[model samples]
Target: VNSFSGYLKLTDNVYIKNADIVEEAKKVKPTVVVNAANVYLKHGGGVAGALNKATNNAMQVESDDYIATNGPLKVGGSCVLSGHNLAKHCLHVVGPNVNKGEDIQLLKSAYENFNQHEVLLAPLLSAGIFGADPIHSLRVCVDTVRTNVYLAVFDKNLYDKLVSSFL
Candidate 1:
């Protein structure tokens, strides 16, 4: 087992699960599922793609219209859609490109815009396709939401470590 380096603060609202994100969506039946995407609602890759497929591309269609009318989705802006197979609603936002550290701020901003409710599932933003530090991303996720936030993590060791840190 891995040992935690230190403790974190202000994480009571954050929940972590080491399982498939899509499976978590099915089980939690969350009210909102946040999709990490680009301004074009490009659900072609990463967690966005998985959510898009799970929701039967309904979000993609709504996103297209949203992007067209609103212009490129600002870093902190998001578009909401209904009809996700698992969650009743979905929030699509353009997470920052991790190559630039500024994306971390963007991550926090996106979460700041989320609706506070029960059962909201989100992946570690910039941790997958953007290759960000997963632990740092988790911290950002935890710090973003005021109410309960469910984190869908794939790595068991990392999840355990995060649990310790947040606890």
Candidate 2:
């Protein structure tokens, strides 16, 4: 059950104290990408870093800065210089291969930060990590994200499916 509050026009009151997505991204964009492996983790890391880097180098490349979260964006950190269609900063925060709780942390961060002009992509958390099925984890992340943020996804196919089911 959810708390009901119509005073401020909010039905289920579940607000974070002072959530700031932009500030979080800014905090993530400096060091992570600089040291990221030659390649970013495929899921949230972007497709092959091919289109992601090409675009950034041509358009979003700003200053000589880089950031890298240990694994996918959010865990280690993010790269704003990499001109991609996702967040200005790539949040690489994939957790240890055996930690589902860590994955949930990423989900929580994304949920709170989605309104801050940033997104915690779903691809990075793919599968087979910490013994958790990739698809299952992705689904969990998706459900959690939907519960908290107003996500505007790109992939049309999945978008349609997600919207069809009111995800």
Candidate 3:
């Protein structure tokens, strides 16, 4: 994969799999500081629900009962998950759009700080269901970070027995 073509560039030295979410995140080696705002109880909690479950699972085996393995990553307030507060250290950073204005800035700072720990996770920008408006979010997210961004999504699975490049 040591190559570059047009505007589609690949870093021969640096590789991050958007599909390998945990490992990539681990690479950034983030001591995750989760901010769950308006991440309240919903009908199904939408697509963010899957992410929330994952986060809860992480906090389960958590030694300090926190999100980060090396943390001090404290929750801002209280939250309930699966009929529980999820954990003792969980916090609720309340608001309408937690990702609006300074919230994004705060998250950006947290992620920037995470690199200091040598951890990197797949960027979950437009992947989230709430992020259905991929174009807008992608533009905003790109503006926020000064690092490599990658996606591992595929438009089609390659299991065709007889295939042609042309549709």
Candidate 4:
């Protein structure tokens, strides 16, 4: 196929799969699924919505309650949430909004926060509405986590981009 979308083994303990990452995370039965969340911790659209739906919306109840007591999480900060039935846990990290020219370490810190978990299911942090570069975020992820990682990538062009850039 001219535009390949399947599986690729990046290196030891690193791999890529083409699919809805939330669905993939479900299949992998990850210890925790990471979310590319906003600082307010709203579990509404994007990957957050998928995760919230997967968690049966019960997790959102906890998220709402937590925010009431905790207020908005600062960018580069992260919080763990009850995964309910879908996962053992969920790690929500606020990535830097590149449109704001926030520090890149904000995203790096987001990935670094998950180092404690071995079975980590991750999306490309800050890559979506935050307006960060996916390829650059991928590099940060590849270099940051010592734990085994399965990156959830949905875009087919990203398939070609990653294959061209990393392979």
Candidate topping lDDT: 4
Error of 3 at 77 (Å): 13
Candidate 3 — worst ten consecutive residues by lDDT sum?
Answer: 158-167
From the highest lDDT down, the ranking of the candidates is: 4, 1, 2, 3
- Span of ten consecutive residues with least summed lDDT in model 4: 1-10
Candidate 1 lDDT: 0.69
Task: Find the candidate with the highest TM-score and give its number.
Answer: 4
Candidate 1 lDDT trough over 10 residues, lowest sum: 1-10
Give each model a TM-score. Answer: 0.79, 0.34, 0.34, 0.86
lDDT by residue for model 4 (1-167), tens? 11223557687766677678777766656678788888877778778888888878887888889999999898888898876766678888888878778888777887887687876777888887678888888888888877777777888778678768984
lDDT of 1 by residue, 1-167 (tens): 11211222235666666767777777667777777777677889888888778878876787778777877777667777774687778777667776655456677777676645555677777677766777777777766777666667767787788677663
lDDT of each: 0.69, 0.32, 0.30, 0.78
Candidate 4: count the clashes: 0
Residue 84 lDDT (model 1): 64
Provide the lDDT at 10 for model 4. Answer: 82
RMSD of each: 5.9, 10.9, 10.7, 4.5
Give the runs in model 3 whose Cα sits over 4 Å from its true position: 1-56, 61-64, 67-119, 152-167
Taking the tens digit of each residue's C-alpha lDDT, what string does model 3 give over 1-167? Answer: 21211212234222222233322233333333222333232313332343345466443343234334333332222232221232222222222233342343333333232233221223323223333233333334344435443422222231121022212
Q: What is the Cα-based lDDT of residue 68 in candidate 4?
A: 96
- Error (Å) of candidate 2 at residue 32 is 19
Each prediction's total of clashing residue pairs, residues at least 3 apart in sequence or on different chains, is 0, 29, 14, 0
Over 4 Å off, model 1? 1-10, 100-102, 115-119, 164-167
